[PDB]
Design a protein around this ligand. Structure first.
Ligand code: ATP
Ligand code: ADP
Ligand code: MG
Length: 1410
């Protein structure tokens, strides 16, 4: 076409048929100089404009940058002179073909652009992008063909082409130099991470990750030695991006449901929000797949060259290079694809793991009755994680099937219509695989549903634990948690067995089709025999389809888990949120709040707890609502906050709100943080609140004073202390409306007077702010501006103090009845060196040592079958040479195929059995870990719980113990299979050759060397993964713990930031993991392809003698052992990582323990008979690193002596009771009860004969029956008697589903008043001779307090009672009274005597008001 262009031809095929074959010279300067050149022009404007569109800040002129420009500049002048040389020496009479014109001119106009693109590239963040960098490689490789041909003409004989030839070398020569300066070097001061700053050629070999790995080897990594993830995927960006799509999809589904009602969206949302990252991988999968069939063909071209002799070295060496470059690009394309999916995996496990938290804030109370802090954790940890694993294998759906057909395509060359039956079995898998899937999903959904029921009934155990220690309920809860565990393993095992059948069928399809296809070929059309060449020629790679079908069986397994996990996220994120419509949050209102005939019900179909409410409060007032227990006080406050759901009414409020919940909620951290609540610190106001609210005395004894770390849910403080913090927090915030729901019940009388006048009084801090109040004590009624007596959700009366008492009624009689050591939580201790081998042995011991032997036996006894199969082919391929077409019989040689078929099945069964003992072996093993950890974490001393947040423990039961169930058991199977793959392959070679197997020796070291170099960097990026995951659950529980407080101050936006930051601290340590895994594949596969290429060259250089099948035997095996070793160094680093999970689970199995529950010494059956209690200078210390909280207490209590104790807040009143139950060890002294030592006997020989009513009411989810008797050892008839005494029958009777009611977490259903009475109900059942009362009247009215008091002094006449109290009203009745301060008992005697003598009790008496 262009022969005239150069006075030559395109390509004379005669040239390429010679041994010393050369590409045509004109050909090169026509297309080989166009292909790279068309690259720039055809694409440069896009890149050139692309960067300028996103113009960034100016660029610092780097030292290296000029080197790039000047060298390219040389290419401009270099190409320039030759153009002049064309016209300077060949312009007159010299025939000048167009090539002499275009060759420099096009380059001259091209290199000029290179300057600009290389210049404009400065302003971009990435200094050496893919575009320019690929040009050099695409040019140098293409330009290489020119280099060689110039040598040939030049070397064989000098010519006149030095004018252009010599110059060309320099032009090409710099290109090599430019690449090194350009494609590799990277440097800049920005972004605090190489991830975004690395030359393209160095960003596909992950050379920029060398820094982390080298750090790991020299020392253990740390949370500060990993770079924060790039802004492309930062939780803030993801949530904002994902949400806008989720909202639209949710609406469409929401409007969709309207159609069905009057008579399935999540997976859509995720796809619609990740267009590119899915599409980009897809187009990057086909390229990988294409190169999957380039390599095998190249091997065939090599064998043909090897077997043949007349072939030229030209086709020989050239094939070897392509065997390297073709595979080399495959590694870059593949790994560049995996790291493009896992990113999508860790990028969808943050949208879900963040959206789940967000929805937790806005879920209506109705929905939260279903989910819990426990269930949502499972949704956050396991379900989200299972939704990240699918992305790894998400693309096998169509990639595999495409490979199958393409593999079939090659095989249909040999076979015609016979293969129709062959595909018949391959399609007979589809319905078999379908039925199992259906029977596999229904068994999966049961597992998750039963996994939640475990955490829910166990998260509550951790939250309320002191109860479990007080009453010996560990056996009961220890006996029903496993009962839920068994209900799961019975299901996980079944789901594991089904994974054996699916695995079995796929490992049997390839061999089954082989047998059937041959039979049909003989059945119908036997006119041709194929000369037995079907043995290996048609089956040389017929089994290549195994790898496709070897990754699938576990792939489908993952998709069922994802298909089920994503079904729950839908149910969660779809939960209806609370409605603020009924609460008209106006801004300009004459009054403060308007109740316009409102009526609110807790749940949809129920009687409203607020009925016909109609009330108005002026812009400044002090309203003090009052009434009987369970009358709607707290609900009315919650109604305004929007928690309740309105029916037939509306509410209006002007301004903001402040809330003080009845059940005080305290965050974790310093006191300052709790009071500040995130607002700017102001010293001036801070001192006012601390002084105004009686906190200074409380700050004295706390170790660190102000900065004294407070324990989750306020373990340190107790009652009065907690309430002061809650009250101060609202006062400091300085809002408009204050809603105080019983804020000062816990505190004593003297403090309460101080609190009211200074803080809430008419001249207090809240002088002008409106302030609703809910008081159970009639003390402050005279000072109230208005009162609202409400009973059963109705305003029975409403008037000022004087106005109400004027009318004779309940209120009139209501009054008449009245008249450094500061740090607790410590950082997780992460093992540094390496997983001690004792951990592996422990896990292996859990598995049956009988089973492991058989499991290994089956696999090794499997591989032998695999060895025989291939060995059979070798003994079968030789048949053709000895026999002939006519001499080969059929009746006697059908055994050859028969053996292969039967032998093929033997391998299929043999692996199936191995996978089966695995299920029993592993499931049982996972059972003995949980049964040990749970049986030990229920015996740790209270000390362990106080310091360790609930986040740590709950994590080891969802995040980790799940790994031992799903991931670790699977990996331990792959490793065994790979290892026996190595042994099988080595035996094959060993038989073939005596001592040439020694090739393994160098290769083994090269692989073992790198593996040992990399494990110590992936292991330390897995402990960090599970060590920075604990705070997520810790914080999440803290949020849901007290929700109403947050929504009262509208501080939601700040809380999002925390969880939005904690996740970013956990992504940083998991994204850096997957990259740390890709870096292994590249810098390992490169060693693989290099080994094959080195063998390939070695083969050709000795082609003269070495020849025959040996070339195929060595290349095929050299390309096989290098595969498994690659597939065995990754797996052996996968068990070495995942086994970290077992290390953490084993960590808590070895924590300290309390004294044995039951010891050899058994107290006499009727040990507690009288009630003697003797204290002998007892000393107590909460933690070893603290001073004696109780200092040398000595006292005695007579039999049946009604005894009470009084003292200042935090004077050991509560601690003294915690000593009887041996919750703390005897630091000094001793105690004897009924003449029996307490430290001598076991804990459960004691705590079953003592009763205590903790100040805090803790309840467990489920029916009231369990919360009153979890042992289930008590009849129902006696329960009613027990409840009746506690004056709780009336409320229970009203509940239609009374006895078998349902109780949410921590008794959310029941008011704090009812919880205390119910918690007192437990005490009635035991009827033990000893009964401790701990502020049981804090959350009860006076009349009800008398009623319960009446029983305790009437129906309990044969049991010593130690009543700890703050109010004195219920202490004069006690026979004796004790006064203790600073852990020192002061007074002891009857109330009358202490009053006669002036002293500490006397002033307490006078100040008490009596
Ligand atoms: N979160 C809840 N879910 C369902 N029912 C609830 C809830 N909170 C309270 N109730 C029901 O409302 C009634 C209690 O009313 P409310 O919670 O307003 O009492 P309260 O002011 O806390 O009482 P008290 O003064 O006795 O402490 C009882 O029927 C209780 O079962
Ligand atoms: N979880 C805890 N860990 C360590 N010390 C505690 C804890 N709880 C309370 N204390 C100590 O108890 C003392 C006050 O006694 P306390 O238990 O508050 O009696 P009461 O609760 O009846 O007021 C404080 O000095 C405090 O240091
Ligand atoms: Mg209440």
């Amino acid at each position: 076409m262009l022969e005239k262009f150069c006075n030559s031809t395109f390509w004379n095929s005669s040239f390429l048929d010679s041994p010393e074959a050369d590409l045509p010279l004109c050909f090169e300067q026509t297309v080989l100089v166009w292909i790279p050149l068309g690259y720039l022009w055809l694409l440069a404007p896009w890149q050139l404009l692309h960067v300028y569109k996103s113009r960034t800040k100016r660029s610092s002129t780097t030292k290296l940058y000029l080197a790039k420009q000047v060298f390219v500049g040389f290419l401009l002048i270099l190409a320039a002179i030759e153009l002049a040389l064309v016209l300077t020496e060949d312009s007159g009479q010299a025939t000048v073909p167009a090539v002499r014109y275009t060759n420099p001119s096009l380059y001259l106009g091209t290199w000029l652009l290179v300057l600009l693109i290389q210049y404009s590239r400065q302003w971009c963040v990435q200094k050496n992008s893919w575009f320019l960098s690929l040009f050099w490689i695409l040019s140098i490789l293409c330009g290489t063909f020119q280099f060689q041909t110039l040598i040939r003409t030049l070397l064989q004989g000098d010519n006149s082409n030095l004018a252009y030839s010599c110059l060309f070398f320099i032009s090409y020569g710099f290109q090599i130099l430019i690449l090194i300066f350009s494609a590799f070097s990277e440097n800049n001061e920005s972004s605090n991470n190489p991830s975004s700053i690395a030359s393209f050629l160095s960003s596909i070999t992950y050379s920029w990750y060398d820094s982390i790995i080298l750090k790991g080897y020299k020392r253990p990594l740390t949370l500060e030695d990993v770079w924060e993830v790039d802004e492309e995927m930062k939780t803030k960006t993801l949530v904002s991006k994902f949400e806008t799509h989720m909202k639209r999809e949710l609406q469409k589904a929401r409007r969709a449901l309207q159609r069905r009602q009057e008579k399935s969206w999540l997976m859509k949302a995720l796809f619609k929000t990740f267009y590119m990252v899915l599409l980009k991988s897809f187009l990057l999968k086909l390229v990988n797949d294409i190169f999957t069939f380039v390599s095998p063909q190249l091997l065939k071209l090599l064998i043909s060259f090897a077997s043949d002799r007349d072939t030229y070295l030209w086709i020989g060496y050239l094939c070897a290079i392509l065997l390297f470059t073709a595979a080399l690009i495959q590694s870059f394309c593949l790994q560049c694809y995996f790291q493009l999916c896992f990113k999508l995996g860790v990028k969808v496990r943050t949208a879900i793991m963040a959206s789940v938290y967000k929805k937790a804030l806005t879920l209506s109370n109705l929905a939260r009755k279903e989910y819990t802090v426990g269930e949502t954790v499972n949704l956050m940890s396991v379900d989200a994680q299972k939704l990240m694993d699918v992305t790894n294998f998400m693309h096998m759906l169509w990639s595999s099937v495409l490979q199958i057909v393409l593999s079939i395509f090659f095989l249909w060359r040999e076979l015609g219509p016979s293969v129709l039956a062959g595909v018949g079995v391959m399609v007979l898998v589809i319905p078999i695989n379908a039925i199992l899937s259906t029977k596999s999903k229904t068994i999966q959904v049961k597992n998750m549903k039963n996994k939640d029921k475990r955490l829910k009934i166990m998260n509550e155990i951790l939250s309320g634990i002191k109860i479990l220690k007080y009453f010996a309920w560990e056996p009961s809860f220890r006996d029903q948690v496993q009962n839920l565990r068994k209900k799961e393993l019975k299901n996980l095992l079944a789901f594991s067995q089904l994974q054996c059948v699916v695995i079995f069928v796929f490992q049997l399809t390839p061999v089954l089709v082989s047998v059937v296809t041959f039979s049909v070929y003989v059945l119908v059309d036997s006119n041709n025999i194929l000369d037995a060449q079907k043995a290996f020629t048609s089956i040389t790679l017929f089994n290549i389809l195994r790898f496709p079908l070897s990754m699938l069986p576990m792939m489908i397994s993952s998709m069922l888990q994802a298909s089920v996990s994503t079904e729950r996220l839908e149910k969660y994120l779809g939960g209806d949120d609370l409605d603020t419509s009924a609460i008209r949050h106006d801004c300009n209102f004459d009054k403060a709040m308007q109740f316009s005939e409102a009526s609110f019900t807790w749940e949809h179909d129920s009687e409203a707890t607020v009925r016909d409410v109609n009330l108005d409060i002026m812009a400044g007032q002090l309203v003090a609502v009052i009434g009987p227990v369970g009358s709607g006080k707290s609900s009315l406050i919650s109604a305004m906050l929007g928690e309740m759901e309105n029916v037939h009414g509306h509410i209006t409020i002007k301004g903001t709100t402040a809330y003080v919940p009845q059940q005080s909620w305290i965050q974790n951290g310093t006191i300052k943080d709790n009071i500040l609540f995130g607002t700017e610190f102001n010293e001036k106001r801070y001192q006012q609140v601390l002084e105004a609210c009686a906190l200074l005395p409380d700050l004295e004894m706390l170790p660190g004073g102000d900065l004294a770390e407070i324990g989750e849910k306020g373990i340190n403080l107790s009652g009065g202390q907690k309430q002061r913090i809650s009250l101060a927090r609202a006062t400091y915030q300085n809002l408009d409306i204050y809603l105080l729901d019983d804020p000062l019940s816990a505190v004593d009388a003297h403090v309460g007077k101080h609190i009211f006048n200074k803080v809430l009084g008419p001249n207090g801090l809240l002088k002008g702010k409106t302030r609703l109040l809910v008081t159970h004590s009639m003390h402050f009624l005279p000072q109230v501006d208005e009162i609202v007596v409400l009973g059963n959700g109705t305003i029975v009366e409403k008037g000022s103090y004087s106005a109400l008492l004027a009318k004779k009624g309940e209120f009139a009689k209501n009054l008449k009845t009245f008249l450094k050591g500061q740090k607790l939580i410590k950082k997780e201790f992460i093992e540094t060196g390496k997983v001690k081998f004792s951990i592996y042995l422990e896990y292996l011991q859990a598995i049956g040592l009988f089973s492991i032997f058989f499991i290994i036996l089956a696999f090794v006894m499997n591989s032998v079958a695999f060895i025989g199969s291939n060995l059979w082919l070798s003994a079968w391929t030789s048949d053709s040479k000895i026999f002939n077409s006519t001499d080969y019989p059929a009746s006697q040689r059908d055994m050859r195929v028969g053996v292969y078929g039967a032998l093929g099945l033997a391998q299929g069964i043999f692996v199936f059995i191995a996978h089966f003992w695995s299920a029993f072996g592993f499931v049982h093993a996972s059972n003995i870990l949980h049964k040990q950890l749970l049986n030990n974490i229920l015996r740790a001393p209270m000390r362990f719980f106080d310091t360790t947040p609930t986040g740590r423990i709950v994590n080891r039961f969802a995040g980790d113990i799940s790994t031992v169930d799903d991931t670790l058991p699977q990996s331990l199977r792959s490793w065994i299979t790979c290892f026996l793959g190595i042994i099988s392959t080595l035996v094959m070679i060993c038989m073939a050759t005596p001592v040439f197997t020694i090739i393994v020796i160098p290769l083994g070291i090269i692989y073992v060397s790198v593996q040992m170099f990399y494990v110590s960097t992936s292991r330390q990026l897995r402990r960090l993964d599970s060590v920075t995951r604990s705070p997520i659950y810790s914080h999440f529980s803290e949020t849901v713990s007290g929700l109403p407080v947050i929504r009262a101050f509208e501080h939601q936006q700040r809380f999002l930031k925390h969880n939005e930051v904690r996740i970013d601290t956990n992504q940083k340590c998991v994204f850096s993991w997957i990259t740390s895994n890709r870096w292994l594949a590249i810098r390992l596969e490169l060693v693989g392809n290099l080994t094959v290429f080195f063998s390939a060259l070695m083969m050709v250089i000795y082609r003269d003698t070495l020849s025959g099948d040996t070339v195929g035997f060595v290349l095929s095996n050299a390309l096989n052992i290098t595969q498994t070793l690659n597939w065995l160094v990754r797996m052996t680093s996968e068990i070495e990582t995942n086994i970290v999970a077992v290390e953490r689970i084993t960590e808590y199995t070895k924590v300290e323990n309390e004294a044995p529950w039951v010891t050899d010494k058994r107290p006499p059956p009727d040990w507690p008979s009288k009630g003697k209690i003797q204290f002998n200078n007892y000393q107590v210390r909460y933690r070893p690193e603290l001073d004696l909280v109780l200092r040398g207490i000595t006292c005695d209590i007579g039999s049946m002596e009604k005894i009470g104790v009084v003292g200042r807040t935090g004077a050991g009143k509560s601690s003294l009771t915690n000593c009887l139950f041996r919750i703390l060890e005897a630091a000094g002294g001793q105690i004897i009860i009924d003449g029996v030592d307490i430290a001598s006997i076991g804990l459960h020989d004691l705590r079953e004969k003592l009763t205590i009513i903790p100040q805090d009411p803790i309840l467990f989810s489920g029916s009231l029956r369990m919360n009153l008797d979890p042992f289930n050892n008590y009849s129902d008839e006696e329960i009613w008697k027990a409840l009746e005494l506690a004056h709780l029958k009336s409320f229970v009777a009203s509940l239609q589903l009374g006895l078998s009611h349902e109780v949410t977490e921590a008794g959310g259903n029941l008011s704090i008043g009812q919880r205390q009475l119910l918690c007192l109900g437990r005490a009635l059942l035991r009827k033990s001779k000893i009964l401790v009362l701990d502020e049981a009247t804090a959350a009860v009215d006076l009349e009800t307090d008398n009623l319960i008091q009446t029983t305790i002094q009437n129906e309990f006449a044969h049991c010593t009672v130690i009543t700890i109290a703050h109010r004195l009203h219920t202490i004069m009745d006690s026979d004796k009274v004790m006064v203790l301060d600073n852990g020192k008992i002061i007074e002891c005697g009857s109330p009358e005597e202490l009053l006669q003598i002036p002293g500490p009790f006397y002033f307490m008496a006078k100040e008490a008001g009596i």
